[PDB]
Amino acid sequence: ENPRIGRAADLYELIPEYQPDTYRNMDKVYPTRVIHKGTKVRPLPAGVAIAPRYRIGGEEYGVDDFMRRNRVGGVLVLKDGKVALERYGLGNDERTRWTSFSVVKSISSTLVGAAVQQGLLALDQPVDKYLPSLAGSAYQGVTVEQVLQMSSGVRWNETYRDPKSDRRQMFDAQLAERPGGILRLLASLPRQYPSGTHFTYSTGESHLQSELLHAATRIPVSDYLSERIWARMGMESDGFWQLESPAGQEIGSSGLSATLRDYGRFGQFVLEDGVIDGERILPEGWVDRASRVEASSHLAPGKLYDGEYALGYGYQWWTFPVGAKALPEHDGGAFEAQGIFGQYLYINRKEKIVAVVWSAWPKPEMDDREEETYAFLGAAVKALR
């Protein structure tokens, strides 16, 4: 039947009939660059197969009821690099590419890491030594590391439903397809806190990661992604990345599309500390500082959003609370990427687990559905020990 794809300007507002079709057809509504795969494809062999179950409202329910309850489009659980569970929903299948939303944040954070391995970026360097457009802006002197940590301290109103918010202005720049629009909005924003001390979720600040990667590698970020990870490790199928303008610059904060198993392959890359075929794409201990939990830091779990959110922050990753504060089954030092409407890429080095979840919730944040996703994933961890 006819695909139900909505207007470019309605991405964050689609009615449910349109969300699946739009999310797996973003290249039919936005400018995109292709992330090329390569000749080699790393295997994801089958492994210990699990039929995880868990309880809700005092009743037991398995994978199908989770998919139905949380409008899930895909679930992949890898254990020890082998596929323990693999479902497609909402029309999808093995070849579908699904948009990441803010999940790409962590990807582009990882790419910063690979650049750091190569000498093109340093975490201590000022972000305007690489983008001179940000000289004399609030972002002058801010470090790469503070931007990774969403800690620049620049005033960023992230509200979507406020038409004159900074998030909405950024969305406007995107919809205008004018090169350098986002970067200009960024350079006109005022300072609010001392850099390094306060956390503000800012998709513009996240996009800075794309801008820096380009300034450093002087190639399109999609090609850098391909060269470091996608064609090296061997993703099975091409991806693509939404652009700010036709043949322009990758959105560093939104808009990547890959197959489910390719998302899993990236997660597997991360689990293995960024090592492919023996060469290190990521610096030693990159993954460790990317997901540091430290009780004294303004990023530690429990401290963000004035204590109304249980996860902390690393290098554009969300960190799970540890110790007595840990969620059931999520204690080893697990960390995730996530993006609105129900997108998760969860990594658990202790258990050697990667999980990918594609969803199409009606609203972009639902506490019931996030905690139920954590419940499902804990049931899987528990079933795989």
Give the H/E segment covering residue 238.
none
Distance CA 374, CA 42 (A): 28
- To the nearest 10°, report the CA torsion of 158, 358, 13, 30: 90
Please tell me what DSSP assigns to residue 243: B
Look at residues 352, 160, 96 and name the one whose alpha carbon lies nearest to residue 87.
96
Distance CA 253, CA 325 (A): 29
| Residue pair 210/250 in contact by the 8 Å Cβ criterion | yes
Counting Cα atoms < 13 Å in the Cβ hemisphere of 238 gives: 10
Q: Two tokens at 176? A: 């205008």
State how far the Cα of 11 lies from the Cα of 155, in Å rounded to an integer: 25
The 343-348 sheet, strands edge to edge? 82-88, 72-79, 353-359, 343-348, 335-339, 318-319, 312-313
Q: ∠ at Cα 314 (138, 379), nearest 5°?
A: 145
Dihedral of alpha carbons 369, 345, 23, 10, sign: positive
At CA 280, angle to CA 122 and CA 289, rounded to 5? 50
Q: How far apart are CA 256 and CA 97, in angstroms?
A: 9
* Amino acid code (one letter) for 96: T
Asked whether the beta carbons of 156 and 166 are under 8 A apart, the reply is yes
Kindly write down the DSSP assignment for every residue of 246-311, as one continuous string: TT-PBPSSS-EEE-HHHHHHHHHHHHTTTEETTEESS-TTHHHHHT---TTSTTSTT-GGGGTSS-
* Resolution of the coordinates, Å: 2.7
| Number of other residues whose CB lies within 10 A of the CB of residue 99 | 26
| Domain range annotation of the chain | 8-384
Architecture of domain 8-384: 3-Layer(aba) Sandwich (3.40)
Q: What is the C-alpha to C-alpha distance for residues 181 and 307, in angstroms, rounded to an integer? A: 34
As a whole number of Å, the CA-based R_g of the chain is 20
Q: How many helices (H) and strands (E) does the chain have?
A: 11, 15
Strands 279-280, 256-258: pairing is unpaired
Angle of helix 104-118 relative to helix 203-217, nearest 10 degrees? Answer: 30
Q: How far is CA 101 from the centre of its chain?
A: 7
